[PDB]
Design a protein around this ligand. Structure first.
Ligand SMILES: O=C(O)c1ccc2nc(-c3cc(Cl)cc(Cl)c3)oc2c1
Ligand SMILES: O=C(O)c1ccc2nc(-c3cc(Cl)cc(Cl)c3)oc2c1
Lengths: 114, 114, 115, 115
């Protein structure tokens, strides 16, 4: 139900071995760890959650862009990239969070389908 | 060797049934038709060319964004979106041209892999 | 020293009346409120801070995109757009944080200049 | 009435010295040269045209991204970024064409205002 895809706008490639942490907003407004992993050779991170576990709520996807750039020997601007959204059952069932990275910029979109 | 992927930033979905025309720059600097099609349900257009046919050169991918928006009842800014690039054999072999559409804006990236 | 500019990719216009909250990470690792404001009719927000007050630190610029879209009667995807960066760690710089908004997408860039 | 602004997503800076060529589609369906210039130290290009000369039509703003990146010693993907639009068809408007550049990607947006 949740996939993350990360692309590199400098090299024209997937962003490989990027750490990604997913959090769920708790009742007390803190961020509780939910899922994490490293992007694959295709820039994708699958297997984060199951349908059962991915209930409605507010989620944060934190992408460790700083470490990514530093490993490539590039000084970047951001500490990380955050994508914060609500999962809503009355919309489509599968969410892809995509991010396109540059050293001083990023873009993100949602692709939400059935 | 060549795939096109189109996404909709308004609806958070693939951009379905978008016409795409691919041209190759000729010796006389005109644009000769090369491949075309309509994006699928996943916003993708595969099967444009083969390895044999996709030789080095300058290519233009024209995405008919205006018709896309109009079919959704939206007035858009652009006539189309153009993506013009050189295919180079000394780089990786597979090219994905991705575009993210809004009524008054678009973004494009290349994902070039082996 | 800190400017925020927001554009609307649907309307082809500045994004006007967008709420922006800036935080700075404290010693104890919490996000301390630093400054806030709203974008003007030109999509710009000036006057957030001063060179004296804008010391080195890790800053978070929270652009209230959902509030913006909801005020226009649109149901958007994201809660906000958060831009987090270290500032002034090689001495004072001027920062523009720019954002381009759509209901299911945004982009952000920084322009950093040395006065 | 027509302004072009270009930013560099790698440097976090204006994109300076970017060549820009504007064309207008003629009656015979060819692209006629309309105006050209280069971005300043602020990444902006002003002075392309006048309200008299900027009549209705289909315009193409060609931003010479490859030339820009090559001048910086970088091998980029695209030849240029082309922005094609109908202008002034409901009377005169002011257009800003903005672009954000990376070596393998760009984004563009328009800001259209009615004076
Ligand atoms: O879900 C997938 O497989 C898939 C593939 C290609 C994709 N290209 C993008 C993309 C492009 C631009 Cl120009 C800006 C942004 Cl934010 C994202 O997202 C993708 C997702
Ligand atoms: O008209 C101006 O002065 C002005 C200023 C800042 C601007 N930042 C952008 C911009 C940002 C992103 Cl993230 C993506 C794109 Cl395509 C454009 O356009 C601007 C225009």
């Amino acid at each position: 139900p949740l996939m993350v895809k990360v692309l590199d706008a400098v090299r024209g490639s997937p962003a490989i071995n990027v750490a990604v942490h997913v959090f769920r907003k708790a009742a007390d407004d803190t961020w509780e760890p939910f899922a994490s992993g490293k992007t694959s050779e295709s820039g994708e991170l699958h297997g984060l959650t199951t349908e059962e576990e991915f209930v409605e709520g507010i989620y944060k996807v934190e992408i460790d862009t700083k470490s990514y750039w530093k490993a490539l020997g590039i000084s970047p601007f951001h500490e990380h990239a955050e994508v914060v959204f609500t999962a809503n059952d009355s919309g489509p069932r599968r969410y892809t969070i995509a991010a396109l990275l540059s050293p001083y910029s990023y873009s993100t979109t949602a692709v939400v389908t059935n």
